[PDB]
Design an enzyme around this catalytic site. Structure first.
Site, PDB file in Angstrom:
ATOM      1  N   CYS D  12       5.813   8.067  -1.037  1.00 39.35           N
ATOM      2  CA  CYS D  12       4.685   8.894  -0.637  1.00 39.35           C
ATOM      3  C   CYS D  12       4.265   8.608   0.803  1.00 39.35           C
ATOM      4  O   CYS D  12       4.856   7.785   1.504  1.00 39.35           O
ATOM      5  CB  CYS D  12       3.508   8.663  -1.582  1.00 39.35           C
ATOM      6  SG  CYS D  12       2.986   6.934  -1.654  1.00 39.35           S
ATOM      7  N   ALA D  15       3.209   4.949   1.211  1.00 33.59           N
ATOM      8  CA  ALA D  15       4.354   4.064   1.383  1.00 33.59           C
ATOM      9  C   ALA D  15       4.864   4.120   2.816  1.00 33.59           C
ATOM     10  O   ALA D  15       5.234   3.092   3.392  1.00 33.59           O
ATOM     11  CB  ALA D  15       5.465   4.436   0.400  1.00 33.59           C
ATOM     12  N   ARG D  46       8.704  -5.137   0.973  1.00 30.69           N
ATOM     13  CA  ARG D  46       9.646  -4.915   2.055  1.00 30.69           C
ATOM     14  C   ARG D  46       9.798  -6.209   2.838  1.00 30.69           C
ATOM     15  O   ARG D  46       8.815  -6.912   3.090  1.00 30.69           O
ATOM     16  CB  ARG D  46       9.145  -3.796   2.967  1.00 30.69           C
ATOM     17  CG  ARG D  46       8.981  -2.457   2.267  1.00 30.69           C
ATOM     18  CD  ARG D  46       9.126  -1.295   3.228  1.00 30.69           C
ATOM     19  NE  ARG D  46       8.699  -1.662   4.572  1.00 30.69           N
ATOM     20  CZ  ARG D  46       9.305  -1.277   5.687  1.00 30.69           C
ATOM     21  NH1 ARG D  46      10.353  -0.475   5.660  1.00 30.69           N
ATOM     22  NH2 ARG D  46       8.834  -1.696   6.858  1.00 30.69           N
ATOM     23  N   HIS D 145       4.648   8.303   7.920  1.00 29.67           N
ATOM     24  CA  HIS D 145       5.005   7.801   9.243  1.00 29.67           C
ATOM     25  C   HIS D 145       4.214   8.529  10.316  1.00 29.67           C
ATOM     26  O   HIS D 145       3.674   7.909  11.237  1.00 29.67           O
ATOM     27  CB  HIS D 145       6.502   7.971   9.510  1.00 29.67           C
ATOM     28  CG  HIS D 145       7.393   7.316   8.504  1.00 29.67           C
ATOM     29  ND1 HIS D 145       7.043   6.167   7.829  1.00 29.67           N
ATOM     30  CD2 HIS D 145       8.633   7.641   8.072  1.00 29.67           C
ATOM     31  CE1 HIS D 145       8.025   5.818   7.020  1.00 29.67           C
ATOM     32  NE2 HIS D 145       9.004   6.696   7.147  1.00 29.67           N
TER      33      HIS D 145
HETATM   34  S1  ICS Z   1      11.180   4.498   8.413  1.00 31.06           S
HETATM   35 FE1  ICS Z   1      12.029   5.600   6.652  1.00 31.06          FE
HETATM   36  S2  ICS Z   1      13.682   5.217   2.779  1.00 31.06           S
HETATM   37 FE2  ICS Z   1      13.110   5.457   9.126  1.00 31.06          FE
HETATM   38  S3  ICS Z   1      10.738   6.115   4.941  1.00 31.06           S
HETATM   39 FE3  ICS Z   1      12.140   4.590   4.275  1.00 31.06          FE
HETATM   40  S4  ICS Z   1      12.613   1.177   7.048  1.00 31.06           S
HETATM   41 FE4  ICS Z   1      14.738   4.252   4.539  1.00 31.06          FE
HETATM   42  S5  ICS Z   1      16.425   5.284   5.631  1.00 31.06           S
HETATM   43 MO1  ICS Z   1      13.287   2.900   2.571  1.00 31.06          MO
HETATM   44  S6  ICS Z   1      13.512   7.062   7.519  1.00 31.06           S
HETATM   45 FE5  ICS Z   1      12.930   3.281   7.622  1.00 31.06          FE
HETATM   46  C1  ICS Z   1      13.269   4.204   5.906  1.00 31.06           C
HETATM   47 FE6  ICS Z   1      14.646   5.155   6.983  1.00 31.06          FE
HETATM   48  S7  ICS Z   1      11.283   2.601   3.799  1.00 31.06           S
HETATM   49 FE7  ICS Z   1      13.024   2.346   5.206  1.00 31.06          FE
HETATM   50  S8  ICS Z   1      14.907   2.062   4.054  1.00 31.06           S
HETATM   51  S9  ICS Z   1      14.718   3.849   8.854  1.00 31.06           S
HETATM   52  S1  CLF Z   2       1.302   8.581  -4.536  1.00 32.16           S
HETATM   53 FE1  CLF Z   2       1.211   6.711  -3.214  1.00 32.16          FE
HETATM   54  S2  CLF Z   2       1.516   5.033  -4.701  1.00 32.16           S
HETATM   55 FE2  CLF Z   2       0.879   6.820  -5.947  1.00 32.16          FE
HETATM   56  S3  CLF Z   2      -1.537   6.542  -6.422  1.00 32.16           S
HETATM   57 FE3  CLF Z   2      -0.912   7.951  -4.605  1.00 32.16          FE
HETATM   58  S4  CLF Z   2      -1.043   6.667  -2.694  1.00 32.16           S
HETATM   59 FE4  CLF Z   2      -0.738   5.346  -4.542  1.00 32.16          FE
HETATM   60 FE5  CLF Z   2      -1.552   4.058  -7.074  1.00 32.16          FE
HETATM   61  S5  CLF Z   2      -3.232   3.209  -8.619  1.00 32.16           S
HETATM   62 FE6  CLF Z   2      -1.353   3.666  -9.902  1.00 32.16          FE
HETATM   63  S6  CLF Z   2       0.244   3.680  -8.272  1.00 32.16           S
HETATM   64 FE7  CLF Z   2      -0.424   5.869  -8.364  1.00 32.16          FE
HETATM   65  S7  CLF Z   2      -1.449   5.943 -10.384  1.00 32.16           S
HETATM   66 FE8  CLF Z   2      -2.760   5.720  -8.507  1.00 32.16          FE
END
Ligand code: ICS
Ligand code: CLF
Ligand code: ICS
Ligand code: CLF
Ligand code: FE
Ligand code: FE
Lengths: 522, 386, 522, 380
Positions: D12, D15, D46, D145
């Site tokens: 999301c 995240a 992470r 992002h």
């Molecule tokens: S930010 Fe993106 S899914 Fe560019 S959301 Fe994701 S730490 Fe992946 S392919 Mo998790 S666009 Fe980074 C990514 Fe790549 S979290 Fe990391 S590995 S290089």
């Molecule tokens: S899409 Fe992202 S992770 Fe989801 S809630 Fe929303 S900001 Fe968070 Fe949070 S406490 Fe549990 S895990 Fe969700 S149901 Fe809510």
């Protein structure tokens, strides 16, 4: 020097300032101790390659052996039969030590008697000792059978066990029909596992040699299982469980799992479970006999093939993945029972665990020791995990076993830096882990002293011990574990990977120093 | 003599000599001469505490053996023993002496360890003590104690007879026959030092060969284990004129009485310091009693040892005997009694704890007694449906 | 720099001199870091009683919670049913996190879907999302049932699950007969265990509420077992094993043991095992329903007592010795099956292990945390072992549960120094272990950070972590362990005593300093 | 954009913002504003490596949350947020800033985190960054992002616009969008420092708020993860005239090319130092190749990432794959190893010359492990 609210035992009581001062005064005044710099120099020297050359040139001195004497194995074998009293013909000190050793490993009562041969017996022999001992043991402990082994004194003097027992029977000390199997178990030949083999062969011979006329191979639709010298209750249990799962009729000859695991319910049970005399007498009627630990069951194998005429399958110890598979397939072939879905699933789960943990297991270097079958099984499993064994030590191993293990190592790319040592003790291994440091040791409790030594050289040189084998004195209830089969493989894998991860956690616990790698997820 | 075939726990002469007397000495290397079994079973099996660098200047927890094979039995082991002594010298250069503890076969194959010991000792300028402690000798560890004491007398004790360079004081004592189980000797020694005495010698527990050699230079011999070291104690009384006495540091009462008895053998200064030590420790052991006697008062122990139990308010009462007398602690075959549902602890902390002797050891003893006697594990033997 | 023969990973690669110099330059030049003396001062302050007073006055801030949100428990409950797809009505981020959390604990694939509610749904509600999601999920993954829970988004906007599912069925998106049980699982109420309870009650209601006319209590001669939120496969296994051993007909409800332990045999199994729909439909016909974890199964208990009319027994979690005895006795009473000799022997063996290890276990001080039933069971077992629990923390506990635990502590002399904390997090616990130091912590992987903190104060202040509970991320395969019954009690006891012995070995490993107490025999 | 009711590991906006951009900033405290779930699942999830004293001056692996209850949902959480900020100030006095990462309910109950942030920031003289990163926004972490970058720009990046006390050099660079997975950024940074450049700013991985504030003072912006930090890079290119470029340090070939490209943007001294660094590291990665390429040549990986694979003799496809590079447990059950170019689960670094050795060893370990050859029971 004690606070009643927080009482300290020897550690850390003796770290108090007054005790420290007292110990320093004792050392400085009266001990005539070498200077600490000299001690440091000698320790460092003992950690070097030159010391290793001198150590490995030993031919008369043994330091910290990794083996015991035959009658210990004879006692363990005897304890696996129903209402059987182990009886060691010889001196009482031996039996005291045997009982203490087994009590410390199993944390259970261990029954064993001696006929207390003293200086009188040293010249006239121990015939009177045998007669009186057998009579007293039968009268007092009411065993169904007395299994007789020997201490080194009896063997050196040359006591004729057969004649002595026959004379005891003839002169009315014991009933003629009362089973008294015997085996010569000289402590100066082989080791404890040899004692187990000799005792088992003696019992099998006693119950089967003179009644082979009416025996038909395979007439009882069962498979004989001879476990050999085994100190993990889980191994007996897992073999029984796996054979029951396949619906295979079996007779586990020398089963001590019940006697070594009696419940605490306010009653002392001298005897519990065990292979019955009827099972031993009917054993030649089995389809076949499987020896779980063939490398110390050679005499038993000779007897079973030559007398019972069983085509004993050429099986390794069922340890790890491939050898368990082979064991199950051979059992399937002999019994005609297919391998059930439950065992297939358990195997797949073991493979799943291996896949989950391979990133941590791969390339890890191990120094291991123990008994030949156990050691070779552990080596095979380590190779299956991608681990690299480096120092394989078997004090009671032989050249044929070494050739076999070398063949196993050559078949794997992970056995390239492995060397097998036979006839070497734990002082040799200490030198080896100093000069060619592995990541971990796998062995019994005596390896703790090696870890201590390695830690004294430095934290970066410490080789942690992983306690697998016999005996384990400094941890509780590890005797209940399993090492055989898929279940034993799972337990071993879990122990190994979590030891690696635990060590990594310890090395990365330093705040703002190494904790950048103190990952939550591993 | 033990009745044959009756499952006793008695050890042999080797256990009495190697395990008890010679083995605790720390700066000496003890060779279990014979087959592998005895040394392996006895290795680090007794908690005779010591201070040292194991494998460099101390060797207590290690197992040195000749590891007799068939050839050694048939053709004798004297040459192997000489070669072994050479190898020991090479690999452990800081050892201050070697003992050769004979196992059973040594006495039956006609090996002459005395000649080898003499020759190699003369060659290497080292004390090599041959002990003929073959397990089949005698009926118990007691003869092993006797043999070990005779070896001490014949080979080590008289080494400094002509030496007069040791500066002696009127307050010189030797602790004889304390095996330092869980540091028991250390807990004793600290009291004696606080009383004004200096313990010149303490063996075998945390003992060095030099301390044994210095023992004939003391003014008093305080013997803990009379059974195992009475021979050497009487020898030193007869030869060097050193008086000896037994001391009991088990519990506050015995400790105080022993301290006063020992101080009575010296001048007024030592007696005053004894009173000071007693006064200093009174509040500690009183606090221990106040805490633990309510938890242990009235509990019955079955069968020197008596003092601490009474100090904690326990009563010493001394198969159907156990069901009749109904003891709480056997206190005298540990796993058998434990299976019968009765705790079994001795007066020395043989298995896992300690020390038990002295004022510091009394606290540990009281805590362990309360822990074991009042543990809920003993109350769960009967299933609620049975 | 790297050497090809000994490649270093992050640790210890970054301990090399060049990396240290680079990091020092970064910190000194650009990070504007506080001086090290200031950091040390603040850390020391955070380890104090005054800090603890300020920490415990928190009313708005939560640091390092020891609980998760409801839909995680709902997903776990749903995974325990046959061919059931956990479906969370709400935002996709939640499902990503739930799957990751369970993958990291179990090291298995975890099935769960979301209907991807976004800003449009935030405005108009998520009805279209429900219709499309149910249709796509059924078409793609072919489940026998879809169990629906909610994320906080759906709960806040007030999506009507019942109406949405009915409209999906009505408008032809899913077949009318297709089972779609649902539960509202608001993340801002209770915890993950609450989600488990809500999901289970929803499924039970769906399958049983409207068909109670023909149900007769005890007509199938079985006992229902509701495990609750359980992350140890061994617990499911041991309950099933004990009931089968006793010859008691049972139906485990929400059984996820198979799906979370699929073998690695080259095929991916989305579904495996689980409670069947017929078992759920027949559940009201059972003799009774036993709730393994009653303190988070309140809604389920209300439904089962009120609708199925089962006299749900007052049983604690079957953990430790006394409570396992009570559980087995109650099962015997309900089913009429006697407790077999095998279970009696297992109990006696547990008591034997307790007797063997009590010297090391007695008086040890523990801080522990986790879910309410797990925590109270652990406290009870610790009291049975003579250990003293000092800091009992349950972030998702309530006042009634606290009263129960306080009553348990008051019944035992080993509960004198115990305090129960509800609504407190692991920062509170960190303060507690600094100010009133226990011997060990028992908890999940998050406690590793606390251990790190304690080690930073000093080795003498370090509180080692023993990993029992959920989640465990930094060790492998601990999810396969058991905590329930005699087998679980044995496993826990072994873990505790060997943790104590390992720590003692560590602190006595110093050559010529503390190794006088480095005993071979313990 | 995502089909409802399909399995996906897609995250999301929260995240993307808290987990990726803001969370690795070590000296700031990040509040997971809302119910307990999101912060707990994202806590220490992470491997964004940092140096600091956790809980005193650094806070990355900690989970700070408002832990919303029902009353917070019904009556709003602004008062709770203000009280929480006060508690954070009291208990963590060495924090250098606070971020407030909104979870889903924050965007739906009409909470005004901006006003609370402004008021408390003015009161405490502290940077408080409100991030409107509610999970339901957008379709993926990508909008997270973007939102996090906008927050950086609006609240942190311009903090030293009027400050001219920082001594600048012509070799000043910022590494942007490197999250220091397994120390990847550190393994990159050393090479840049060995080339003669001064890495003034490095964020988010092992990032400090001062480094973000100092970023507009650099000469070049080296962006590792363009997808997540292109917004801020473009903003800095417009407002401050700072050029930005992408760098790839995955495998010796990509590393060499990127180092040469970066050095080409400076004077001859930097280019000479670049050649020296390449020469220094040539035997190490050559040795790595010599050891591991025979074990990996010809193996097929199915899909920045490509470089190390071709450097190890591997074949990249887009199958019959030996390895999948582009959910891991599903493929593992299917019997195919799954591994990203970053070493997210347990290992690293993989970038740079030092990371190449680790990457090659891990590839050989995973692909040649006997566990993959034991899927079929010998009796089946
Ligand atoms: S930010 Fe993106 S899914 Fe560019 S959301 Fe994701 S730490 Fe992946 S392919 Mo998790 S666009 Fe980074 C990514 Fe790549 S979290 Fe990391 S590995 S290089
Ligand atoms: S899409 Fe992202 S992770 Fe989801 S809630 Fe929303 S900001 Fe968070 Fe949070 S406490 Fe549990 S895990 Fe969700 S149901 Fe809510
Ligand atoms: S020496 Fe003797 S059996 Fe006096 S052989 Fe034995 S360390 Fe006992 S009652 Mo073990 S005469 Fe010492 C003894 Fe007492 S080994 Fe210890 S406890 S005080
Ligand atoms: S009474 Fe005593 S312990 Fe017994 S042998 Fe004799 S000295 Fe020794 Fe030794 S190797 Fe084994 S244990 Fe014996 S049978 Fe021989
Ligand atoms: Fe026991
Ligand atoms: Fe798995």
């Amino acid at each position: 020097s004690q606070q009643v609210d927080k009482i300290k035992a020897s550690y850390p009581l003796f770290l108090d300032q007054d005790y420290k001062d007292m110990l320093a005064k004792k050392r400085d005044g009266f001990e005539e101790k070498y200077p600490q710099d000299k001690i440091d120099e000698v320790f460092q020297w003992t950690t070097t390659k030159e010391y290793q050359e001198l150590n490995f040139q030993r031919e008369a001195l043994t330091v910290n052996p990794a083996k015991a004497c035959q009658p210990l194995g004879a006692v363990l074998c005897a304890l696996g039969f129903e209402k059987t009293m182990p009886y060691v013909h010889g001196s009482q000190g031996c039996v005291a030590y045997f009982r203490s050793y087994f009590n410390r490993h199993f944390r259970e009562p261990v029954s064993c008697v001696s006929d207390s041969m003293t200086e009188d017996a040293a010249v006239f022999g121990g015939q009177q000792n045998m007669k009186d001992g057998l009579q007293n043991c039968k009268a007092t402990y009411k065993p169904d059978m007395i299994a007789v082994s020997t201490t080194c004194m009896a063997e050196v003097i040359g006591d004729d066990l057969n004649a002595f027992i026959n004379n005891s029977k003839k002169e009315g000390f014991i009933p003629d029909e009362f089973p008294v199997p015997f085996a010569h178990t000289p402590s100066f030949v082989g080791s404890h596992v040899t004692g187990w083999d000799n005792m088992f062969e003696g019992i099998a011979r006693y119950f089967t040699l003179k009644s082979m006329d009416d025996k038909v191979v395979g007439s009882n639709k069962k498979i004989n299982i001879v476990p050999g010298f085994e100190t993990y209750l889980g191994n007996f249990r897992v073999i029984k469980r796996m054979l029951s799962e396949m619906g295979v009729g079996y007779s586990l000859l020398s089963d001590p799992e019940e006697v070594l695991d009696t419940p605490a319910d306010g009653q002392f049970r001298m005897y519990a479970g065990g292979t019955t005399q009827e099972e031993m007498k009917d054993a030649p009627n089995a389809l076949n006999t499987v020896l779980l630990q063939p490398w110390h069951l050679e005499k038993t194998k000779k007897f079973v093939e030559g007398t019972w005429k069983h085509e004993v399958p050429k099986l390794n110890i069922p340890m790890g993945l491939d050898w368990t598979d082979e064991f199950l397939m051979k059992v399937s072939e002999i019994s005609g029972q297919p391998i059930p879905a439950s065992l297939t699933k358990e195997r797949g789960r073991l493979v799943d665990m291996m896949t989950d943990s391979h990133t941590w297991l791969h390339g890890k270097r191990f120094a291991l020791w123990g008994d030949p079958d156990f050691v070779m099984g552990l080596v095979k499993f380590l190779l299956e995990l991608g681990c690299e064994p480096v120092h394989i030590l078997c004090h009671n191993g032989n050249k044929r076993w070494k050739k076999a293990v070398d063949a196993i190592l050559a078949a794997s790319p992970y056995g390239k830096n492995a060397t097998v040592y036979i006839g070497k003790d734990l002082w040799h291994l200490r030198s080896l882990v100093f000069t060619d440091k592995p990541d971990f040791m796998i062995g019994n409790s005596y390896g703790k002293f090696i870890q201590r030594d390695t830690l004294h050289k430095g934290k970066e040189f410490e080789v942690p011990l992983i306690r697998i084998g016999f005996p384990i004195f400094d941890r509780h209830h590890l005797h209940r574990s399993t090492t055989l089969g898929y279940e034993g493989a799972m337990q071993i894998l879990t122990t190994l990977v979590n030891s690696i991860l635990e060590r990594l956690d310890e090395e990365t616990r330093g705040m703002q120093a190494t904790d950048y790698n103190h990952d939550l997820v591993r | 003599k033990s009745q044959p075939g009756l499952m006793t726990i008695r050890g042999c002469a080797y256990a009495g000599s190697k395990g008890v007397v010679w083995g605790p000495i720390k700066d000496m290397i003890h060779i279990s001469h014979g087959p592998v079994g005895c040394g392996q079973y006895s290795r680090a099996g007794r908690r005779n505490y010591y201070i040292g660098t194991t494998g460099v200047n101390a060797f207590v927890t290690m197992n040195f053996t000749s590891d007799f094979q068939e050839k050694d039995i048939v053709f004798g082991g004297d040459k192997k023993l000489a070669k072994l002594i050479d190898e020991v010298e090479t690999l452990f250069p800081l050892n201050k002496g070697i003992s050769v503890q004979s196992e059973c076969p040594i006495g039956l194959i006609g090996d002459d360890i005395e000649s080898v010991s003499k020759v190699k000792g003369a060659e290497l300028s080292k004390t090599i003590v041959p002990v003929r402690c073959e397990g089949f000798r005698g009926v118990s560890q007691s003869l092993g104690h006797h043999i070990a004491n005779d070896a001490v007398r014949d080979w080590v004790l008289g080494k400094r007879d002509e030496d007069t360079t040791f500066a002696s004081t009127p307050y010189d004592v030797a602790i004889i026959g304390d095996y330092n189980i869980g540091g028991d000797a250390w807990s004793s020694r600290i009291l004696l030092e606080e009383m004004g005495l200096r313990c010149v010698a303490q063996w075998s527990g945390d003992g060095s060969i030099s301390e044994i050699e210095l023992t004939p230079k003391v003014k008093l011999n305080l013997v803990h284990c009379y059974r195992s070291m009475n021979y050497i104690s009487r020898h030193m009384e007869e030869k060097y004129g050193i008086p000896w006495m037994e001391y009991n540091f088990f519990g506050p009462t015995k400790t105080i009485e022993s301290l006063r008895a020992i101080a009575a053998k010296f001048d007024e200064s030592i007696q005053k310091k004894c009173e000071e030590v007693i006064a200093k420790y009174k509040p500690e052991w009183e606090a221990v009693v106040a805490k633990y006697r309510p938890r242990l008062e009235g509990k019955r122990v079955m069968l020197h040892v008596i003092g601490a139990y009474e100090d904690l308010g326990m009563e010493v009462v001394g198969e159907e005997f156990v069901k009749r007398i109904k003891p709480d602690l056997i206190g005298s075959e540990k796993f058998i009694f434990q299976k019968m549902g009765i705790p079994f602890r001795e007066m020395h902390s043989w298995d896992y704890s300690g020390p038990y002797h002295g004022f510091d050891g009394f606290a540990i003893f009281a805590r362990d007694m309360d822990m074991t006697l009042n543990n809920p594990c003993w109350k769960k033997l009967q299933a609620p449906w049975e």
